[PDB]
């Protein structure tokens, strides 16, 4: 249930959170034996209330006493609906509320306005993304066994070439387009491996074939996971690195990018070819995300870029 070992983030489902006798208690079908009792309550913990759960104001009081962030997310924890805002660590605020302020916003803003540094960040994002493609498509054979048998030499050549291109070109405007070309080739490779036939990527949900729908669902979950990552870091969604400065919710899409083609896309084609239900697809996606430590990776990346930007 520990959703991110890097963030001390826990997912609670099928239980009520209430305060009896001055201690926050979980009313669950397992009673005393539920693992929720092992939840450490400290300023380092952060909760994610899941499906079928409710919380009492008294609990909110006790958690605030202990300084524990709370957030509501849907099935499996991908769509993050609402959460507590996290503080910002600077010398002029200084409340004693015992809430672990986080300093990453200052680091982010310290460079966000300098375009050259912003570009350097974009490059760093894409380096990470490609290396996660090469990892999941080649190094690990779980997909191979599942049925996603694809050629390697063509994929390796394409990825090598795109990586070679990343280290070049002057502005965001090229990077976006280079990624788009890589995207197209990856789609073609996946369709060939899946024997799905010809594939064309419609957008704004105009597609009707299973592949398109499953891609949309997968991307929706990925966005939710990224939103969780940013919220844990406290960075507002508007300070995008690679998407346009006017794009509402740009940053989450920047962060979501580092898994779409690594983990969502193959599963979308696999499930479409296998003829799965939408529910089966959702469960498979969440299982893949859990297996890959996705949230932890996207946390590590954001921290790495912050430290590297100095």
């Amino acid at each position: 249930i520990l959703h991110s070992k890097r963030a001390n983030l826990y997912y609670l489902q099928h239980c009520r959170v209430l305060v009896n006798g001055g201690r926050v208690e979980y009313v669950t079908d397992e009673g005393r034996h539920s693992h929720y009792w092992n939840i450490p309550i400290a300023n380092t913990t952060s909760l994610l209330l899941g499906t079928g759960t409710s919380i009492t104001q008294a609990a909110m009081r006790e958690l605030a006493r202990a300084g524990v962030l709370v957030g509501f997310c849907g099935g499996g924890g991908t769509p993050l609906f609402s959460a507590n805002e996290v503080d910002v660590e600077v010398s002029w605020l200084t409340p004693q509320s015992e809430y672990r302020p986080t300093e990453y916003l200052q680091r982010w803003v310290g460079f966000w306005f300098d375009e050259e540094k912003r570009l350097v960040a974009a490059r760093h994002f894409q380096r990470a993304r490609l290396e996660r493609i090469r990892h999941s498509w080649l190094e690990d054979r779980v997909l191979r066994d599942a049925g996603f048998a694809v050629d390697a030499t063509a994929l390796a050549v394409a990825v090598e070439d795109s990586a070679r291109a990343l280290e070049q070109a002057p502005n965001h405007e090229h990077l976006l387009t280079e990624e788009a070309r890589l995207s197209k080739r990856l789609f073609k490779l996946a369709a060939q491996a899946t024997r799905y036939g010809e594939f064309v990527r419609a957008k704004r949900g105009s597609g009707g074939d299973p592949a398109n729908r499953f891609l949309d669902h997968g991307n929706y979950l990925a966005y939710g996971l990224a939103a969780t990552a940013t919220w844990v870091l406290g960075i507002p969604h508007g300070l995008a690195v690679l998407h346009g400065k006017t794009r509402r919710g740009g940053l989450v899409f920047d962060v979501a990018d580092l898994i779409k083609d690594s983990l969502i896309l193959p599963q979308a084609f696999l499930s479409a070819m296998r003829g799965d239900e939408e529910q089966d697809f959702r469960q498979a996606c969440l299982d893949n995300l859990s297996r890959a430590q996705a949230l932890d990776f996207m946390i590590d990346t954001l921290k790495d870029v912050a430290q590297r930007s100095t």
Binding site: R16, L18, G21
Partner: protein
Amino acid sequence: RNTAVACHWIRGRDHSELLWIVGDASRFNAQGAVPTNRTCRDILRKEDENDWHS
């Protein structure tokens, strides 16, 4: 005892007020709204937790 009537006044553009209620006031809340559904089932379950904060 079954009588229950509520009278609302529109004192102007984009504001309304409650004047009086005749009969069983329990059929309305303070602002004059009416419940959507009611059940004798114990849905609130206030029994579960207690105020012994120490």
